[PDB]
Design an enzyme around this catalytic site. Sequence first.
Site, PDB file in Angstrom:
ATOM      1  N   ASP A  62     -24.210 -38.457  13.441  1.00 25.29           N
ATOM      2  CA  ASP A  62     -24.668 -40.076  13.224  1.00 25.29           C
ATOM      3  C   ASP A  62     -24.184 -41.390  14.154  1.00 25.29           C
ATOM      4  O   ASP A  62     -24.918 -40.341  15.343  1.00 25.29           O
ATOM      5  CB  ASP A  62     -23.758 -40.743  11.475  1.00 25.29           C
ATOM      6  CG  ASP A  62     -24.131 -42.274  11.141  1.00 25.29           C
ATOM      7  OD1 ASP A  62     -23.119 -42.628  11.618  1.00 25.29           O
ATOM      8  OD2 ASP A  62     -25.117 -42.141  10.621  1.00 25.29           O
ATOM      9  N   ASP A  82       0.912  -1.054  -0.240  1.00 26.55           N
ATOM     10  CA  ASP A  82      -0.048  -0.129  -0.345  1.00 26.55           C
ATOM     11  C   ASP A  82       0.665   1.396   0.607  1.00 26.55           C
ATOM     12  O   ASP A  82       0.093   2.093   0.008  1.00 26.55           O
ATOM     13  CB  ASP A  82      -0.988   0.270   0.699  1.00 26.55           C
ATOM     14  CG  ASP A  82      -0.151   0.005   2.106  1.00 26.55           C
ATOM     15  OD1 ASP A  82       0.488  -0.794   2.802  1.00 26.55           O
ATOM     16  OD2 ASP A  82      -1.008   0.724   3.532  1.00 26.55           O
ATOM     17  N   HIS A  95     -26.389 -36.736   3.935  1.00 26.82           N
ATOM     18  CA  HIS A  95     -26.529 -37.689   5.511  1.00 26.82           C
ATOM     19  C   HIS A  95     -25.126 -37.394   5.911  1.00 26.82           C
ATOM     20  O   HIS A  95     -24.613 -37.136   7.178  1.00 26.82           O
ATOM     21  CB  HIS A  95     -26.300 -39.254   5.685  1.00 26.82           C
ATOM     22  CG  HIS A  95     -25.595 -39.816   6.309  1.00 26.82           C
ATOM     23  ND1 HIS A  95     -26.458 -39.551   8.018  1.00 26.82           N
ATOM     24  CD2 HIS A  95     -24.498 -40.614   6.512  1.00 26.82           C
ATOM     25  CE1 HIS A  95     -26.079 -40.513   8.326  1.00 26.82           C
ATOM     26  NE2 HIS A  95     -24.568 -41.132   7.519  1.00 26.82           N
ATOM     27  N   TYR A 152     -23.358 -51.467  14.927  1.00 23.93           N
ATOM     28  CA  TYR A 152     -24.841 -52.426  15.073  1.00 23.93           C
ATOM     29  C   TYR A 152     -25.371 -53.637  15.558  1.00 23.93           C
ATOM     30  O   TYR A 152     -25.667 -53.347  15.441  1.00 23.93           O
ATOM     31  CB  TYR A 152     -24.212 -51.824  12.975  1.00 23.93           C
ATOM     32  CG  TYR A 152     -24.238 -51.735  12.140  1.00 23.93           C
ATOM     33  CD1 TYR A 152     -25.797 -50.643  12.678  1.00 23.93           C
ATOM     34  CD2 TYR A 152     -23.854 -50.887  12.247  1.00 23.93           C
ATOM     35  CE1 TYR A 152     -25.733 -49.047  11.430  1.00 23.93           C
ATOM     36  CE2 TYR A 152     -23.920 -49.280  11.350  1.00 23.93           C
ATOM     37  CZ  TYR A 152     -24.705 -48.597  11.473  1.00 23.93           C
ATOM     38  OH  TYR A 152     -24.742 -47.719  10.601  1.00 23.93           O
TER      39      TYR A 152
HETATM   40  O1  LIG Z   1     -27.383 -46.193   9.827  1.00 27.14           O
HETATM   41  C1  LIG Z   1     -26.896 -45.305  10.470  1.00 27.14           C
HETATM   42  N1  LIG Z   1     -25.865 -44.174   9.696  1.00 27.14           N
HETATM   43  C2  LIG Z   1     -25.866 -44.940   7.970  1.00 27.14           C
HETATM   44  C3  LIG Z   1     -24.921 -44.987   7.675  1.00 27.14           C
HETATM   45  C4  LIG Z   1     -24.650 -44.888   6.385  1.00 27.14           C
HETATM   46  C5  LIG Z   1     -25.394 -44.021   5.776  1.00 27.14           C
HETATM   47  O2  LIG Z   1     -25.581 -44.684   3.837  1.00 27.14           O
HETATM   48  C6  LIG Z   1     -25.742 -44.506   3.217  1.00 27.14           C
HETATM   49  C7  LIG Z   1     -25.976 -42.468   2.991  1.00 27.14           C
HETATM   50  C8  LIG Z   1     -26.554 -41.291   2.372  1.00 27.14           C
HETATM   51  C9  LIG Z   1     -26.337 -42.009   0.792  1.00 27.14           C
HETATM   52  C10 LIG Z   1     -26.261 -41.373   0.332  1.00 27.14           C
HETATM   53  O3  LIG Z   1     -26.663 -40.454   0.076  1.00 27.14           O
HETATM   54  O4  LIG Z   1     -27.436 -42.185  -1.239  1.00 27.14           O
HETATM   55  C11 LIG Z   1     -25.721 -43.525   0.305  1.00 27.14           C
HETATM   56  C12 LIG Z   1     -26.100 -44.522   1.998  1.00 27.14           C
HETATM   57  C13 LIG Z   1     -26.553 -44.295   6.102  1.00 27.14           C
HETATM   58  C14 LIG Z   1     -26.863 -44.030   7.662  1.00 27.14           C
HETATM   59  N2  LIG Z   1     -26.965 -44.299  12.145  1.00 27.14           N
HETATM   60  C15 LIG Z   1     -27.494 -44.537  13.040  1.00 27.14           C
HETATM   61  C16 LIG Z   1     -27.797 -43.939  13.955  1.00 27.14           C
HETATM   62  C17 LIG Z   1     -28.262 -43.603  14.918  1.00 27.14           C
HETATM   63  C18 LIG Z   1     -27.738 -45.535  15.605  1.00 27.14           C
HETATM   64  C19 LIG Z   1     -27.867 -45.712  14.803  1.00 27.14           C
HETATM   65  C20 LIG Z   1     -29.249 -46.366  14.240  1.00 27.14           C
HETATM   66  C21 LIG Z   1     -29.696 -45.498  13.587  1.00 27.14           C
HETATM   67  C22 LIG Z   1     -29.568 -44.274  14.629  1.00 27.14           C
HETATM   68  C23 LIG Z   1     -28.573 -44.640  12.541  1.00 27.14           C
HETATM   69  C24 LIG Z   1     -27.491 -45.971  13.575  1.00 27.14           C
HETATM   70 MG   LIG Z   2       1.764  -1.365   4.348  1.00 30.11          MG
END
Ligand SMILES: O=C(N[C@H]1CC[C@H](Oc2ccc(C(=O)O)cc2)CC1)N[C@]12C[C@H]3C[C@H](C[C@H](C3)C1)C2
Ligand SMILES: [Mg+2]
EC number: 3.3.2.10
Lengths: 546, 546
Positions: free
Chosen positions: B334, B184, B523, B465
């Site tokens: 999650d 500057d 997600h 799980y």
């Molecule tokens: O399963 C859980 N996450 C999955 C993990 C992988 C994902 O796969 C995806 C997600 C997005 C897409 C897309 O965009 O196409 C594809 C596949 C789906 C969500 N989380 C919980 C969290 C609590 C505890 C227990 C039971 C319930 C409540 C769900 C696990």
């Molecule tokens: Mg300066």
Amino acid sequence: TLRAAVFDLDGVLALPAVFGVLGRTEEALALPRGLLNDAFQKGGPEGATTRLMKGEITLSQWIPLMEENCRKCSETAKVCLPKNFSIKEIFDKAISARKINRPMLQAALMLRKKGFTTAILTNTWLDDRAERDGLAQLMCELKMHFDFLIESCQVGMVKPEPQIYKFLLDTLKASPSEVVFLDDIGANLKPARDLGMVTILVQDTDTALKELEKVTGIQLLNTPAPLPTSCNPSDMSHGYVTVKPRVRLHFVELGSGPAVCLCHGFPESWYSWRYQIPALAQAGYRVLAMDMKGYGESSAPPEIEEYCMEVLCKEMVTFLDKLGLSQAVFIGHDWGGMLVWYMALFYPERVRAVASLNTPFIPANPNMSPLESIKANPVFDYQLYFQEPGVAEAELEQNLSRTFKSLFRASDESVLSMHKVCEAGGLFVNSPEEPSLSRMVTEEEIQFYVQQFKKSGFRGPLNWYRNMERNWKWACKSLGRKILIPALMVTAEKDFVLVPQMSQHMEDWIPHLKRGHIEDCGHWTQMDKPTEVNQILIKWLDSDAR
Amino acid sequence: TLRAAVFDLDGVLALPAVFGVLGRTEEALALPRGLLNDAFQKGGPEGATTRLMKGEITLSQWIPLMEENCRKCSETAKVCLPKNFSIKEIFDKAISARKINRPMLQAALMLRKKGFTTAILTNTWLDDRAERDGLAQLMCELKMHFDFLIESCQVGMVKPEPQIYKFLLDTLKASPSEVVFLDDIGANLKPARDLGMVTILVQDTDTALKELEKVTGIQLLNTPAPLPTSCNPSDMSHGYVTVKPRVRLHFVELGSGPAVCLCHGFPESWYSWRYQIPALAQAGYRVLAMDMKGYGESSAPPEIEEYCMEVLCKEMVTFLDKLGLSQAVFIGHDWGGMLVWYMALFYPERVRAVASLNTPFIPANPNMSPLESIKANPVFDYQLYFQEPGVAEAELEQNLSRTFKSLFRASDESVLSMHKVCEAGGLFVNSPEEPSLSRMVTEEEIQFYVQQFKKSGFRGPLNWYRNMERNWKWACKSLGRKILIPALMVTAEKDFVLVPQMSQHMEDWIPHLKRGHIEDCGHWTQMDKPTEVNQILIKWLDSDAR
Ligand SMILES: O=C(N[C@H]1CC[C@H](Oc2ccc(C(=O)O)cc2)CC1)N[C@]12C[C@H]3C[C@H](C[C@H](C3)C1)C2
Ligand SMILES: [Mg+2]
Ligand SMILES: O=C(N[C@H]1CC[C@H](Oc2ccc(C(=O)O)cc2)CC1)N[C@]12C[C@H]3C[C@H](C[C@H](C3)C1)C2
Ligand SMILES: [Mg+2]
């Protein structure tokens, strides 16, 4: 025959017990004697306080339930609760009022040290008050000294229900007649006694300990003042930061609060701060205890220049950067002392506060080269011995056990003479093959250093001594400057190399320098006088680094 | 032909420039126009301000020197300095007044991203004021985005002395006609120009950038809003804590302040928080981003029970204990979301504050077993597929690249259907071998996950799980309780599994729950909407966790 020790918390490991605050509140507020305890116990096993202690509800769900109980108790007793009566208020005061009962804890410490399985068994609650951190702290400070902590609300059971004692005996892998159990409430002892456990009603602490002493056959009371808490290397969080492609820095990390960076000396380790690391964490600080470059799990490039003061400082700043720290307090001893001073001088913005143990701040003599200066002092001879790459490495790496056993000695215990090492042709020529263990360190502590120096040996550490010229040129750039950040200097009476008089001229460069002195203290300050060290530093940090 | 970019700080990367505070002070205090700058420059190369900038003296030694200069300048100009005139006071205000100039930094960012060697070249001082931390912060936030930082006081040279430009060209490994330099102050450009460097007088930012755009042929201004800062794994501090003999927990650590513990989901990594980790550190927080048990550099014992919720929570508490943390803020997404909720429920004393992304707090149904519940929702099918040890591991570990490329997709970008996975006999049966890169992640980011899951694969993560029964029994103990600590819930519009309506009933268990919503968000929340995530969390932490 006794192999295990169980301590109640409230009334045994912590005082004053919250049940007694109930009496003093009653007295304070001129309420019917016992009203607060009638209300507390209301409904026995079906009551609110059991649900709390069993973990069925949180402390905050419990609070209004207890208020109701006080209403119902005060109605039944035909008195009116005072204007602005607040159970929350009362329990806040009570819980924050209690502190660890030093004599008792140390008694438990002792018993563990002589091999007892110790545990805390306590009825307690899930605390969700906005001020829960206080109690969280206490339990932290307390749980690290015991093999187990069994909390009523965690296990779903309460004293004095017999099930919890069975659980206790199970957790201990002991049979009832192998445990002593201390509690301040008689009802709770009854079931321990039924199983054949030694018990102790804890009214005054000292009497409780006399019984404990008698039953265990170990001296608990009047015993000598114990060392500060140490560190088991494998219970520590270990950090790693790459400061540049060749070079990683390793540190040990404990506590939260202002960042405090501990810089050990030659030839040492993060482990040289084992007595300070808990103390400061407990005092409110985030302690980052370094392996300085060249040592332990830190990198040790072989080139000398990698160890000059400038590079070492650059790399510490980078350490701060990658770790996200805009500042930290720097505390070093010996070589680490020298380095923190230059940190203050070249990087004040990054140094919250500086302190050194034994290592005075000596400026460069612009007129006399460091080689000349080092010749001007007989006690510095060993430094010339260190110059020739290879010589000192070979002597020092030949027997590691021997090396540290010989170096790490208290004042009365000296077995080397840093005097005319060159002429003699070595550091160990007229010192023993198998020195006696010094009173400061155990065989296990010495072996820790042994296993560390097996990684890189002495090249790296010795290299710190091999940049006398480079460091002198560099230091000269700071002849114009002064240290105006907070600064502590701490002298060791019986340091026969870093003598306290070498520090006499320091106020000329550091006008607000604060001082600490330690009598009967050799060169290895932290492990020689850990209690004193902790006292001086914590006091200093609280006034100056906060 | 342009390959390097150099930015002044004061007036270019930071505004307002301190030289302009000098004019406004003059104007404020009705002093002779330019008095403060005459006093500042007094003595040119032999003057106090050069010594400062050269590093010969510290900022605090400089302060009274500058006062004298003001006296001498005011005497010579036959005016009287105002009562209570304070150079310290003025420079305090000035230095704290300046902030990073967003448009400019981002311009430098862009240029680096298209491959330029960027650097800050600045005249500056060794700051030892009690308030130096402020400036220390700024320089930290700024230096991480540049290949070099050359400070006048560190290198012993000043703009506009020709030597510093030579040093600059040397540090850059560039020849003068390959650098653009922004400043500057015109005098400072003169010597860059003499060597044949492209230069830019920076008056208003936008005009400066238009010139920069023109000379570099890259769009700098009006460009799309850039992503938050990410993390290079190998520039991070990596932590390791053994929570019990089998099991070590690994975390990444950045910032200081209240401790914030980030808990990633399935099947993810500390790296899933790469966009949050800088933001929060910058916001005033100590970020501890976990590898959850089973992932990355954390341990992965094969037994299922090692992964039930109770053990996982115990182990997090132990994490706090060994690290010396009485509390931390818990933030999870999650599975990590589920876990932080139960942390709040079983360990309120250790949780400063809780927040979840996508994962609502669902209580156990005491009356209906979780196996029944999971059947009651078609979109949960994939969870039954996960039960049989071995099946899902084999599909998921078969092509890692494929796995993550397929999972990690934005809303419009879906290539899987979590719908009737069981029947289909797999997760990938009618999805591609080589999915397209999703717009959220680069090839390099996907490979990072790839290299991580090569360590332990999917057994550990999948095991999370496989404790539906155990976790249900456990959770039932908390049916009596409520979450009364500060709590945030953050919903993702286009989460087709953790749909925002699953959260509707949460105020029943969490009465003071605070909420965040993110539209157009799949997600994989952190990497889908990092800007929004950062905005919501930082805002929440500042009001609730401090
Ligand atoms: O399963 C859980 N996450 C999955 C993990 C992988 C994902 O796969 C995806 C997600 C997005 C897409 C897309 O965009 O196409 C594809 C596949 C789906 C969500 N989380 C919980 C969290 C609590 C505890 C227990 C039971 C319930 C409540 C769900 C696990
Ligand atoms: Mg300066
Ligand atoms: O040499 C430095 N420490 C030695 C390390 C080994 C120890 O050996 C001992 C110590 C004690 C005993 C005993 O009790 O018998 C025996 C041997 C002697 C001190 N520190 C510095 C610190 C600064 C910078 C540079 C020059 C000067 C100022 C000394 C290094
Ligand atoms: Mg008691």
